[PDB]
Amino acid sequence: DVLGHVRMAHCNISKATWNETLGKVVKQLRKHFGNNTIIRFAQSSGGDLEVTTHSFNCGGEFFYCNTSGLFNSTWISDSLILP
Amino acid sequence: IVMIQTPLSLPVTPGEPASISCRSSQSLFDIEDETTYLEWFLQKPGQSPQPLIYEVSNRASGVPDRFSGSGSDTAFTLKISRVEAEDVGIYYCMQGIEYPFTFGPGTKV
Amino acid sequence: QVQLVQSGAEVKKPGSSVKVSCKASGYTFTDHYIHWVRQAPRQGLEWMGWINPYNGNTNYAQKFQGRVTLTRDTSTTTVYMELISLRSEDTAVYYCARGGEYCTGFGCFAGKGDNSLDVWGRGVLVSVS
Amino acid sequence: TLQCTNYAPKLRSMMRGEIKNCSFNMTTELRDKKQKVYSLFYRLDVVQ
């Protein structure tokens, strides 16, 4: 059963920290792909839930988090919650 | 957009039972959710509409037990065991299954 | 308890822009959609649109696209609706309502959509003349 | 074979159908008897 109210499993990632993390990743990718190119992050295009979501196990439970809120940006030359 | 009709807008006296009908041009039953999204409201004179029934038969908290209802397949009925002074106002039936939501012309008590 | 607080009244000339507020209290502001419904005098209720108070995503009835803009303030927990190009046929009481379904106990970051209106405010009467 | 309905908690929550309440006849200690069990399953663990 469920005691109390039903609430969705979720993950909290700091928005500013992730934005800085992606900025660093983009800089390093530009080193290989070109200083003047555009690096776009996007959600996984398809396949089993194991590969379209962030699969992990903590607390003894197996979580599948969307992550579409983390990889949805185009890089040209307070908190984020993942369902 | 789904059009909603509300037949049987009739005067009643205190202590009389009443029945208010609602008819939809399109079925309100969501196969995956296994529920019909028809919310009944009562708008008292001078007040905003308040919920009465959230899902055809599932009575809202704080609503007198005199209010009930049933139906399916677009045809729904709101029933009142006994009409009292607090039942005066305009009754509406929502079309929650799809956006935009519609309420129908409504009936008066 | 759960409340939506609206107050006052406004009178506008045709073509004017009006902002109608809706202050939320007693529940998590970001975990229910806020819907706007118009009620013209002596007429029935007409749904206008819905704003997601967490993301700011909105959806409007086709007749209101391009005329109604919804915004939010999550620090003040208030939703505002801006109406432009007011016409005589737009005289109505404008009500805000809280959806009956919660999105998630921590906010509207996921979900299919709303299906009901649980809490209604008193509404704001807007007249055009 | 499971016979499932939506969990349907008391409060409305835009997550209807994510958890299903499934009835089934499970085995028990003795092979001549079966036990009716009501279990909750996630939507992703069952197919119609």
Place this chain on the structure above:
Amino acid sequence: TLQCTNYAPKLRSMMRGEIKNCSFNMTTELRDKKQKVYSLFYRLDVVQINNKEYRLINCNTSAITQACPKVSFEPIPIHYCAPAGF
């Protein structure tokens, strides 16, 4: 589920109930048929469920592996020998 009665031999013996005569539906070579079996069990090997209904003492805790009837349990001497270096 076993349906047991006391063995009840012809002669009276102050040991009534120590051996029970239990009826049950056992499987057979084919999965579409069952065989009615009457077996004797010791009182200590069965418990009452509540002819009376009984179960084996272990059906609550463990599955039975039958010892092979061809393998003797008689103890034999076993010698333990050191490995080289010990």
